[model samples]
Target: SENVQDLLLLDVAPLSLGLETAGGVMTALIKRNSTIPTKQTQIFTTYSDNQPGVLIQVYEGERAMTKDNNLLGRFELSGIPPAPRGVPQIEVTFDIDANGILNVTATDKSTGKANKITITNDKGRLSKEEIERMVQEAEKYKAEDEVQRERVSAKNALESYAFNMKSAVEDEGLKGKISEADKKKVLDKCQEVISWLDANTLAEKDEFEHKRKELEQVCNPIISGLYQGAGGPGPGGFGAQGPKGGSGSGPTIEEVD
Candidate 1:
């Protein structure tokens, strides 16, 4: 006999976090490194012959399938009453922000508030009062983490700048023979990026990702060139340096001020 599964649903991450499978293990879509206030949505449908409600079960963690992830909570939308199975519609949205917190909301096309409920981590795990108290406790830790992040970020920028610059200069084809002015230009850009990174503004995340990717694109060819030059040339004489160099890894949010 078929049975309805009682579940808890919460908007843990504002988007459906799909995972990548490796060696048959699933990785996460929105990783731990992702910034907060992010959202993800997926469209789904009912499958029963005359399904009266669509149950939404939510989870978190680095697993591809629901069974493998952390079961956050579950909820259901039933105002639609009874409809032919496979015809019910649902749009699941998950929104998570910088604090690693989430807010989930849903709207039913067929009816009113019967399909709405606001569930929080506190409500799911403990009493409302207990949840509030824990939040206060967690706030202290969160503040400390922010302070440490800033200190680490400043240090990372300094080291990252030096590393990238040294890597670039090693690229004989590009920075190796370039004039002092070009070298300064590269250094200046890196410094600027690091400074911008320290701001920790939400808008900066996209810009930072773009800048880092751009740096990688520009340096990869040069870096590869150096690698080839260092190797014993096959069939040919000593090869000249190619185009770019650098690790291209950028500072993380936890490292920023």
Candidate 2:
């Protein structure tokens, strides 16, 4: 008799593992130098008030920050029951197979819905000293990474808001309504914000939010003015025809809510 294929049990991964947490830090679920063919489960909680979904980013390597580690991938675990901060129970499992591939699965305990992502080929490319340097660098750069992520998200918010304002200002119905000065006021400031966003890629999160607030403050009054005058004559156009029968029957409120 002869033996078939032999099973080799000496496999292990030098890369540690975890998912990205708030403030761009890596949440340590599995320690470094842990042997493969193992898995771990943890019950994670919501960080925001009345949160309903999760954006889980997986990373490899033992570091204080995720930027210092290799990103495996990201998956969204949505449809979570509405709950306040730290109230929702999200069960997460990290399983490493024999070939050192990582399988990350997250489930909403209350809803019984789950999402998973498979991560492979993120192993054994760096030396021990390189891993040590990552640990040191992560500690040093933790604060910067937190703000960097925040700043990027803020920039995105401002960019979308600016585009939305442009769409509103260019509306055919409201084009004849706004005065020349008011139109300039809305567009010039929006253009300034667009240019500033391009120039200051590393601007602070507060700064982006401030620009968005300033743009909103300048545009809101002019926008409301158009809506308020809509019931007068030409502005009423077509949408206000339904309530046109009654003098004070709430022009657009009936169809709205």
Candidate 3:
């Protein structure tokens, strides 16, 4: 008693810290139950050539993919130096302190620039009982969780597609080329997708997928038209806009969810 003063520290990671990756996986950086005042850095690369930005979604859960997990926050690291896929190195750091606060920092190794986000006010937290309950019901919850994940994935995909289509229609140069009627039509379609997202609660994966496919059918062509104005072919056509055939096909929008 004389030699020991009371200083207790049992802080641990409340939930897993992960980044969204290919194949719908949540790539964990700092796993649950890890000691406090800990940090982990992971290296990621761009998925496409000349990628200017990367969307980082921070999540908390034990699920295999981020769509099944709870989202904490998301931020984009932009202005990355242009390079081929998997060329530039982006280092993401997840640091959890004894107070259970999270601080995420992303550094572009090629550009020597960094962006950071601090979780001070609102990152979802679970109580001990809730955590225990989830663990106990893991087996029963798997199917339900997968459905929820599918809903989330579908919603996110639709939102990204809508956003990209909206952005293209508003571009100064692109807008001028397209007739006002077409621009309005495209904008209206984007709004329709958003409205569906806001109003519908998908109960079945088939319904969500159907909605996504419907929106893609309407939106992709408009996106292609904008790029085609610059002499590039539409989505899935691997060719630049030149000489009737040029290799310049790429995903018109950034893939998320």
Candidate 4:
């Protein structure tokens, strides 16, 4: 008779753990091939000033854009202290176990309050055999994924640009900051980009790049002027000062595998 040894458990990431970033980029938090029972954390920020909260959509895939990946889950960490874009820090965590189960969490650095989730569905989970097959088709998938990512990324970026411009036009705080002529220019340029986005066709990299640069040129000066004059404290100030009265003020967000 022989005694059996303890079973050695091994697991692989079914898909890359990614965050939905500005411009629809899939910012990888934990990459594929990472050993299971592993954990990783990353910090993110609001994209606009005086932002109340942020909606974080987590995805699982190797694609560069979130839309091209399998959405795992989404949650909002609200009640954030009012601050500039890129000011209040949000910590996101991804934890996976040997059982192929996932636990995602987000904590506001300005407040200890947290939002967490356990992925118990099959949507983003894949079997070992499926993972192996995908590994084998990596080359082909890479090429195709890149093309689709760019198309979607460009479209998403344009949409955000348009929305931001519209907000600026309506914000009372921005009235004197941006002249009517300047606002009109941004609005017109946004319309052009909107048309391109609506076409739902892939544009060349150069085309998107040029349009983005054009928008930045018109926006940068006015935005700088606003922040320097009426926008009050900047992002760094809020980050340095921390939250005045809240439960979550801290510098780090943690996750355990």
For model 2, state the Cα shift of residue 156 in Å: 28
Global lDDT of each model? 0.42, 0.62, 0.62, 0.62
Model 4 backbone overlap count = 5
Error of 2 at 213 (Å): 78
lDDT of 2: 0.62
- Tens digits of lDDT, candidate 4, 87-156: 6777777787767777878788887668988885334445546655554454457776666556554221
Ranking by TM-score: 4, 3, 2, 1
Residue clash pairs of candidate 3: 231-241, 239-246, 239-247, 239-248, 240-246, 240-247, 240-248
lDDT of 3 by residue, 1-257 (tens): 66764565446775667667533545667877788887998777655457677777787665644554556788888868778767778887878876777888988888988998887422455644665564445446767555544543321110111123345355454355654543433444454334233467567554333333445445444443433344666778576664665566766567763
Candidate 4, which ten residues in sequence have the lowest lDDT sum?
Answer: 154-163
What is candidate 3's TM-score against the reference? 0.48
For all predicted structures, in order, the TM-scores are 0.33, 0.46, 0.48, 0.49
Location of the lowest summed lDDT over 10 successive residues in candidate 2: 154-163
Clashes of each: 27, 0, 7, 5
Candidate 1 vs candidate 3: the lDDT winner is 3
The residue-by-residue lDDT of candidate 1 on 1-257, one tens digit each, is: 49645553332333334322112222233534345556665434443335455554444443222233444555665655466543444544556654555544444444543343343433244434553454344344645434433433311000101113245344444444554544433444454334334565565334334333435345444343433445565675677887877657768747767
Over 4 Å off, model 4:
1-10, 121-257
lDDT value for model 4: 0.62
Error of 1 at 153 (Å): 42
Q: Which tens-of-lDDT digit does each residue in 1-257 have in candidate 2?
A: 48555565446555567777644445656656677876888777665545566777777665544555766688877788776666667778888887778888888788999999887744444655776677566557757554554543311000101113245344444355654443433454554334233365575555334333445445445443433434544555555444455465456656756
